[PDB]
């Protein structure tokens, strides 16, 4: 009869609106501790740079139109501070008031809160901010004066890069600090290397493998673990989030992985008539069928819509997620879906990988740009665990396609069968996504064996020899161009193991096939020189 | 062994190169009656306009590099004229020579040929051309002179529109003539209307539902059945293609639908050691499991690679196709996959449809443009039969996604579960593809009932009343209550009346439908709403 929703953004409002469409007469109350509901908080970084000109553009729907269209009782500046699940009352702080509201059903969608980093002097710092809501933006925009020159972003995740990009676009000298060994920890190191290059190309300093230990001089100085210092006029904390579970814990709502709220197949908690959705809940990673946290807007919107279906008596299941993310870094796009190689192995999965470098559309049609794709799959069954993409254009499309293939339980053997919208302006007859399947098939079926960039030095140190098959146009390397290899194939030593490489793995794979059938042990360098020079520029 | 391949483009060369990678020692011979192999014939329309500047950009791989890289014996200007499946010899004409070549395996990839319509004066016409290869292009370049002003394209399919767009960019007065009732026959009428609007916006005259009766005055005049005449300095015939099967028929190779070559699960014909791939073979439409011709480059490339796997002893199956097509019409993109509503019904399928009007990315991020998506699905199981898209941006992505959903046999119940690359510049948290699944679930589950544009008049004639819920800022016998006032003014309606709700988009009229349904009032939603209705039935 009476449904109260805690949280008035992605999860909460999606439930509230769907609830109204399913139950015209139900009383639906939305509690939002902040000043606005349905604010496009995902667009906040682009307002800092000016790409979103007016702040009103970020208020999706006003509270006046929400009551008119859906007759919702929305209550900003209402912070819920306690839940009694047995009496079914919540306690709310509103300005100076302490209010008590009874509920019949309760939907928890409080989202996530910023990780409080373990940095000394944070309380005395005056130029350190997070950017997750309008109150945060208000503080950040008041600090961005003409005298502000240097900014530092701590945390190089997808959101951390959007902050750094848009701060650079404001004319600031930006430095990016990541604890992990590379930017975009969600990506694998060799794919993240293309992003670091784009940041350096645009005068964004990157500091990896080093954490922030202290804020000195009221935040004007940031101390790193090595003792290196950074000057900062404005510091943005984007070091990840943790579920906002303090209220749930105090109410006896059970939590699990990383403090997320545990829910069953119908989004229900361990408490009677209390459901949960959004960033605050533990979801099922469908690739592993194990618990995970996937703090993204698309799942949150779906979960809110589906918990409304549940409460309204429809049979709807909480099925889980795989996770699909994307960020634009100046003239480059980086996206991923599912599990990276590192995460796949960390989950106990048996993995193989292949790297493909293509174009977003036919090369003979002008404007074609390079694409880098990676696939992580099972080396016998062909089950797909994840994919990563780097490129100026066409990356969102390829990763969206591969996300859909994972949802459909398609294996590498099915990727060549997919039919895409091919015309010279839009793609290639054999799309890069088709090629991932062809290349992956050759590895499973034994027609190709590849070597990874992180294996090359050790393989060469053990006695392998690098065969460079580039056209005349490494040191201890034999150089026979592909066009001459079939005739000069007798110069090679048949008792030697070779690792074939070109600029792209296509021409080296053709050579590998020649050598294999001539009785010469040969492997393909996955990604070839183009990838190796990017991630291991020194070796 | 020795493998001979007839046809040296998409299917044939894809087979030849894959065979070489699998069998270094095999003799591979490619016969091509034309002057080049591996020519990017799909780009020929864009060379006409100059968007592809130099013709060499269209020769993918030169003849020298093919023998250097793959040690292939490629033979252009070699037309095969007979096949003896028992002797295992083919007869080839090369200039003045008649040659005999023996084979162990034979791959047929002769492709398709233009359907020549029965228009009078075709042989005496001097300004009429097809554009399917370089020899065709050589003839067309003689007609693209400084004195050429008016051009006519007969046939408004996907390729026909590419011809019209690129001819217009050449500065010519272009007219398009289609026998069918609307441009892009593959699309449904209400979706094709967006394409005709873009054509007219760019000064391309469109004549639909009429055929060409005669080419008069050596082609400078084209007369239409209505008696109307068209002046033309250059006429392109793009009225579809038919399988090039003359060689197969003469050799005892069985043929099927529309003359296509019949092949089994391993691309093999009824003759021993003769295989076939490409536009020339009958494929299985996977949505219906029925025979079909899907003359597209992506299937042809896949088929050629897989018949090589077969001939080399690998386990590979000929699984079929669904068909995915796209065309750019100036500032618009039109794409489709699977079966249109019309084609689904013609195949005997039980169909329902839903139309979604969205944006390619978040509206609060600048540059967002409109997207029109249509879904054709089964109204009980949710099986997806096809989808169509219209828009300046994001259409290729959405239709590729939905094509992938069909391949994985995802239903409308799975579309809301898909997770896409959402960031303000690239999409929406609830993507238009997600939204298709939500709206389709409401129909299957009975929470919404919709009325199609072609049903409206009959429903209103039977007693239903149109409820217009647009904000007052036009239909005839329509009750007008804006959505923002409907909840309070809900008592003005007649509860013994059936209402059909409409707005500019189906989202707000669906919300209103939900109000009425729960107030005990029979209500349905107009699918596509006023925006789509005004486009197809002005
Ligand atoms: C700057 C930024 C950029 C992002 N960009 C992207 C992107 O490009 N793509 C993407 O997919 N995701 C992105 N996200 C993540 C996305 O915003 C979240 O995954 C999504 O909002 C989660 O929805 P939710 O309802 O669980 O939580 P939220 O959207 O965080 O909402 C929770 C709400 O509950 C309120 N609340 C909490 N506790 C209480 C209480 N006790 N009483 C009352 N109200 C309470 C909070 O104030 C808040 O309004 C971004 C997030 C941020 C901050
Ligand atoms: C202008 C144009 C635009 C197109 N645009 C698109 C598009 O945007 N997207 C898309 O997916 N597809 C497009 N296509 C279709 C695509 O080209 C075909 O689907 C594909 O090429 C089919 O490959 P194939 O090998 O079966 O036949 P083809 O590519 O036609 O090649 C067959 C070859 O065999 C040769 N041959 C035939 N008979 C003999 C014989 N007896 N002896 C010797 N040689 C012989 C022919 O000369 C020809 O070179 C387009 C085609 C054209 C012409
Ligand atoms: N980076 C890469 N690493 C390994 N193999 C690759 C790579 N890029 C392309 N290939 C392979 O190289 C081939 C590229 O196919 P194309 O059709 O583009 O070229 P082709 O005309 O020479 O056949 C495919 O081989 P396959 O048919 O034997 O599977 C594809 O799998
Ligand atoms: N063209 C359309 N025709 C019918 N229904 C539509 C259309 N576009 C959107 N909708 C529906 O309208 C709703 C759109 O939801 P949004 O998330 O965009 O906005 P909201 O905040 O009002 O929920 C969905 O309703 P549902 O959750 O009950 O399914 C969606 O199904």
Author numbering:
A (entry chain B): 1 to 473, 480 to 545
B (entry chain A): 1 to 473, 479 to 543
Q: What wording appears in the published article?
A:
Additionally, CstR regulates coaP, which encodes the coenzyme A (CoA) persulfide (CoASSH) reductase (CoAPR), which reduces CoASSH to the free thiol and H2S. The biogenesis of H2S by CoAPR combined with its specificity toward CoASSH over other low molecular weight (LMW) persulfides implies that RSS, specifically CoASSH, confers a greater physiological impact relative to H2S in this organism. The enzyme responsible for clearing toxic CoASSH in E. faecalis is CoA persulfide reductase (CoAPR), the structure and molecular dynamics analysis of which revealed a catalytic mechanism that is consistent with its persulfidation status in cells. The N-terminal CoA disulfide reductase (CDR) domain consists of residues 1–446 and harbors the first catalytically active thiol, C42, while the C-terminal sulfurtransferase (rhodanese) domain is composed of residues 447–544 and contains the second catalytically required cysteine, C508, which is persulfidated in cells.
The asymmetric unit is composed of two molecules of EfCoAPR in a tightly packed dimeric arrangement, consistent with a homodimer assembly state and containing two FAD molecules and two molecules of 3′-phosphate-adenosine-5′-diphosphate (PAP), with the latter found in a region where CoA is expected to bind. While inspection of the electron density revealed that the PAP moiety of CoA was well-ordered, the remainder of the CoA molecule could not be placed in our structure, which suggests considerable flexibility in the pantothenate portion of the ligand (see below). The modelled PAP moiety was ~13.3 Å away from FAD riboflavin moiety, which was fully modelled and refined. The dimer interface is extensive (3600 Å2) and is largely stabilized by hydrophilic residues, contributed primarily by the CDR domains, with the FAD bound such that its ATP portion is close to the “bottom” of each protomer, with the isoalloxazine ring in van der Waals contact with the Sγ of C42. The two sulfurtransferase domains of CoAPR are on the periphery of the dimer, effectively wedged between the two reductase domains. The 3′-phosphoadenosyl moiety of the PAP portion of the bound CoA forms an extensive part of this interface, deeply buried in the sulfurtransferase domain 10.7 Å from C508, wedged between the α1 helix of the opposite protomer, the terminal helix of the reductase domain of the same protomer and the core helix of the rhodanese domain (residues 512–525), which is immediately C-terminal to C508. C42 and C508′ make their closest approach from opposite protomers, but they are 26.6 Å apart. A tunnel ≈25 Å in length connects the aperture of the solvent-exposed catalytic C508 and the CoA cavity located in the rhodanese domain to the C42 and FAD binding groove, located in the CDR domain of the opposite protomer.
